[PDB]
């Protein structure tokens, strides 16, 4: 009896659609979008007769529900069914929002199929329909020795992360992976429960005392830190990665007498903190005999043993610029050299997490001594190392 169903956002984009009658098509979609989303001076009314096709609509937050019909439908039955559907969605995946609908397409489709078929709004009881739906929606809102005592509160929190990348010479990134390990030292007394606040933003061997049962809610982690240095776990985040440096090498084979190479490093992190020990290795064809290098920043030298040009920067701030231009003397050779197309390799270290991982909170509660968590004075230093960071050229 219900000829269709559509869900609209504030801009009128059709998030979901389910057409049951043959008569209703994209013309009805455009009709509703134009006639309610782009209304100019017409008086508001839930049911509108346009093109001999009815259009029921119920507004919920920033979501427009439209139950398009093309018959003598029981007029208030559609409204009752829409309210029941909203209640069912509230029971399943809570409040209606853009993210919820965008992430629960399968749940929405299954729910519409179960509650509605050919236009007759069948039973919508939550308990009855619970057993009839197999999909579930996604909602987005160490032993120690006895008597361990430390007179001085010394705690280590090192975020060691390895960044790897290989971009196209034109500037397009192809593949990147990260292997991160966390090492901490806990010079603490008693048996306290320590809370570690962090923004996961990713789903992931963990320690014996580490339990990840409730890791879904932010962090919600509780663990007993053993004494000494140890590895927490291995993880890899790719969705949210902040590349510390970018290299755009502009090489040019101007004949065989000489070769022109131009590499630019463009820091793109926060300028408040300074990267240290910036090393860039520019490979050189084996036909070289003597080369001259000019660098706007730092100093560079030629390493004939490694058959490459070494470039070192003492320290630079964020969002700076540096120019290295080298005139490469090229031997005449015979043929088929092509310089083998070697990538541009760089190594460095930065005082921040390459993945953007920032500690949220660190609460320490000791049942025995009962000292405040704010009484623990500790400053956190980060050592963000670099792995095989090579850019193709």
């Amino acid at each position: 009896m219900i000829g269709g169903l559509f869900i609209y956002n504030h801009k009128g984009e059709v998030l979901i659609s389910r057409v049951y009658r043959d008569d209703i098509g994209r013309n009805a979609v455009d009709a509703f979008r134009v006639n309610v989303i782009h209304a100019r001076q017409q008086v508001r009314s839930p049911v509108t007769n346009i093109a001999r096709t009815s259009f029921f609509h119920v507004k919920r937050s920033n979501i427009w529900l439209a139950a398009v019909t093309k018959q003598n439908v029981n007029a208030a039955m559609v409204f009752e069914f829409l309210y029941k559907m909203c209640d069912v969605m509230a029971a399943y995946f809570g409040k209606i929002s853009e993210e919820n609908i965008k992430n629960n397409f399968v749940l929405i489709y299954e729910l519409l199929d179960e509650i509605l078929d050919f236009g007759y709004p069948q039973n919508s009881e939550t308990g009855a329909l619970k057993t009839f739906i197999t999909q579930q929606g996604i909602k987005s809102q160490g032993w120690r020795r006895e008597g361990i005592k430390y007179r001085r509160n010394e705690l280590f929190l090192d975020v060691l992360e390895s960044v790897n990348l290989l971009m196209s010479p034109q500037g397009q990134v192809l593949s990147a992976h990260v292997s991160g390990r966390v090492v901490m030292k806990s010079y603490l007394s008693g048996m306290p429960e320590c809370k570690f606040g962090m923004n996961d933003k990713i789903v992931i061997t963990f320690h014996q005392c580490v339990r990840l049962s409730k890791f879904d809610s932010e962090r919600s982690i509780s663990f007993i830190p053993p004494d000494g240095e140890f590895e927490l776990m291995r993880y890899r985040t790719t969705k949210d990665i902040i590349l510390p440096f970018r290299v755009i090498p502009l090489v040019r084979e101007v004949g065989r007498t000489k070769l022109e190479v131009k590499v630019v490093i463009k820091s793109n992190f926060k300028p408040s903190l300074l990267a240290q020990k910036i090393e860039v290795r520019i490979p050189t064809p084996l036909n070289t005999s003597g080369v001259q290098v000019i660098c706007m920043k730092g100093k560079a030298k030629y390493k004939a043993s490694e058959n490459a040009i070494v470039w070192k920067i003492k320290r630079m701030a964020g969002m700076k610029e540096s120019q290295i231009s080298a005139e490469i003397e090229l031997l005449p050779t015979n043929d088929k050299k092509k310089w083998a197309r070697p990538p541009i390799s760089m190594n460095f270290e930065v005082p921040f997490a390459p993945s953007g991982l920032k500690v949220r909170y660190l609460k320490v509660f000791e049942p025995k001594l009962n000292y405040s968590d704010h009484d623990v004075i500790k400053w956190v230093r980060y050592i963000g190392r670099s792995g095989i960071y090579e850019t193709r050229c």
Binding site: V58, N72, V73, N74, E110, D117, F118, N123, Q135
Partner: protein, 557 residues
């Protein structure tokens, strides 16, 4: 590998729902349908739905898979396969669907039977011309008598959808003692099943008074909480069964007294249900006035109702206002007068005039409150007020004529075409007293074009009236609208009426005076009624959209 396959299928379904075409991966999903997990098969069938409902053509090749799946023992997958096979609107769908459906109708599961009934209704929509459709229709009637309520509800819905074709068939349902079965279904069905079966039962007819009384007594207690769907269908079937004589047993009076309270309570739900219930009670009040006789207090619109609910509450309040409720209605309208909303305030100030025409006892009070409301000096308020006073003059003649002066004191702007028509008509009709009528109607004849057709027509009639009342002075102005609206205007209605007047004035002026300037009858308390036969046939369609649109179902399908 099953979990990886399920994850891949879910990712493919999400990508298809995103908008990108994934028709290249169709064979993988088709092959993946041969699994054992119910969730995997269901998720495949949703993927197939994504293509089938919108544009079916690429999923036709899965007919063999559908036939193979239809024999599965779990009722969920069996019903899913039946629905999926029926969902594709193709010519060959009938051939592959008829054989499984006959065995499906006798499936040992209520859910399978309900899905089969919906599938029968789906198959009757496309390519239902052979005797197989008639056989399925005959089998459905036998299927109506069943233990499960879901199956009887869905079968009744299928029969209602099928009965669109009327080849001299009595809706392909109903029989002796079958109404008892339908009421027994009402006893144990769900809310939506109750709606379906009651909408179908409203298409029956009563043979004797005893049967009608029994049916009415059985239906009334089913005032559920499905908003105004089950209750509206209940009142529709009750009023359609109002075959009881007024001079009969004390049930009709009991029926009205038991029907008024539940119908009052409809105005307590969500605003859309408010709107539908308001239009429907509007129709019911217009048909039967002795239901909401002493329940006006519920229709007073508060600040929590939207614009359409406000307007319809005012409409029904005007419908219910009588001499005994003038004080409250006018006080509440004076309160409404300062509600900022332009459409609502126009309706509220026009209510003061429609009530004045409706109730002749309090015309003086209505005029007093109209004057006090005009003193507000608001442009749209004053324009709707001049329209209202134009309406009042046609009802009470030569009694309130002085009011147009104290309203013209505040006519700084005239922009509403209805207000312009009202002022022009008022000047034209009383042209033997307004000395400046000639000057006014000459002033109006500057932008004659680019005006609404009603304004043009009323101005033309007013000018001809002014000519017929003062022929000597103004026989140089009537020929300035009879050669400016009959020659220079492209409006066959307007142009032909202009020739009608032109020929009356030039053939026999005595008949012209006896025709145009005739003593018109009064409005006679016309409260915007509906034609009796249209109301009679809309009472048969209370629940449907015919009531909300106030049009018969033949005018739109």
């Amino acid at each position: 590998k099953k979990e990886k396959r399920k994850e891949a299928v879910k990712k493919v379904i999400a990508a298809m729902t995103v908008g990108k075409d994934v028709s290249s991966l169709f064979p993988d999903v088709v092959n993946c349908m041969q699994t054992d997990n119910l969730e995997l098969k269901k998720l495949v069938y949703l993927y197939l739905m994504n293509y089938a409902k919108s544009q079916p053509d690429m999923a036709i090749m899965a007919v063999n898979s559908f036939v193979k799946d239809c024999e599965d023992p779990n009722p969920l997958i069996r019903a899913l396969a039946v629905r999926t096979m029926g969902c594709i609107r193709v010519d060959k769908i009938t051939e592959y669907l008829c054989e499984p459906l006959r065995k499906c109708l006798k499936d040992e599961d209520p859910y399978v039977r309900k899905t089969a009934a919906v599938c029968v209704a789906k198959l009757h929509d496309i390519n239902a011309q052979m005797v197989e459709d008639q056989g399925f229709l005959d089998s459905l009637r036998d299927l109506i008598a069943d233990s499960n309520p879901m199956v009887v509800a869905n079968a009744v819905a299928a029969l209602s959808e099928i009965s669109e074709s009327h080849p001299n068939s009595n809706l392909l349902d109903l029989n002796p003692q079958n109404i008892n079965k339908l009421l027994t279904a009402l006893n144990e069905c769900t809310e939506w099943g109750q709606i379906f079966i009651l909408d179908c039962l409203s298409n029956y007819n009563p043979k004797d008074d005893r049967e009608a009384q029994s049916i009415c007594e059985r239906v009334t207690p089913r005032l559920s909480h499905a908003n105004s769907a089950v209750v509206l269908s209940a009142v529709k079937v009750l009023m359609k069964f109002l075959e009881l004589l007024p001079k009969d047993s004390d049930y009709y009076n009991m029926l009205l007294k038991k029907l008024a309270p539940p119908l009052v309570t409809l105005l307590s739900g969500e605003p859309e249900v408010q709107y539908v219930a308001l239009r429907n009670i509007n129709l019911i009040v217009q048909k039967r006035p002795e239901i909401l006789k002493q329940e006006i207090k519920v229709f007073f619109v508060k600040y929590n109702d939207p614009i359409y609910v406000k307007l319809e509450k005012l409409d029904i309040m005007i419908r219910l206002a009588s001499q005994a409720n003038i004080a409250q209605v006018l006080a509440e309208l004076k309160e409404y007068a300062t509600e900022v909303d332009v459409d609502f305030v126009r309706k509220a100030v026009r209510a003061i005039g429609r009530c004045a025409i409706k109730v002749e006892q309090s015309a003086e009070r209505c005029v007093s409150t109209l004057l006090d409301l005009i003193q507000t000096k608001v442009n749209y308020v004053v324009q709707e007020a001049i329209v209202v006073i134009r309406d009042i003059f046609r009802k009470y003649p030569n009694k309130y004529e002085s009011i147009i002066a104290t309203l013209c004191e505040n006519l700084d702007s005239l922009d509403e075409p209805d207000a312009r028509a009202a002022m022009i008509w008022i000047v034209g009709e009383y042209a033997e007293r307004i000395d400046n009528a000639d000057e006014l109607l000459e002033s109006f004849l500057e932008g004659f074009h680019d005006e609404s057709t009603q304004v043009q027509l009323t101005l033309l009639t007013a000018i001809v009236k002014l000519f017929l009342k003062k022929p000597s002075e103004t026989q140089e102005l009537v020929q300035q609208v009879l050669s400016l609206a009959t020659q220079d205007s492209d409006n066959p209605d307007l142009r032909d009426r202009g020739y009608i007047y032109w020929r009356l004035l030039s053939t026999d002026p005595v008949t012209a005076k006896e025709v145009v300037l005739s003593e018109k009858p009064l409005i006679s308390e016309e409260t915007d009624l509906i034609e009796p036969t249209l109301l009679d046939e809309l009472i048969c369609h209370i629940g449907s959209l015919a009531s909300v649109y106030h049009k018969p179902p033949n005018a739109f399908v």
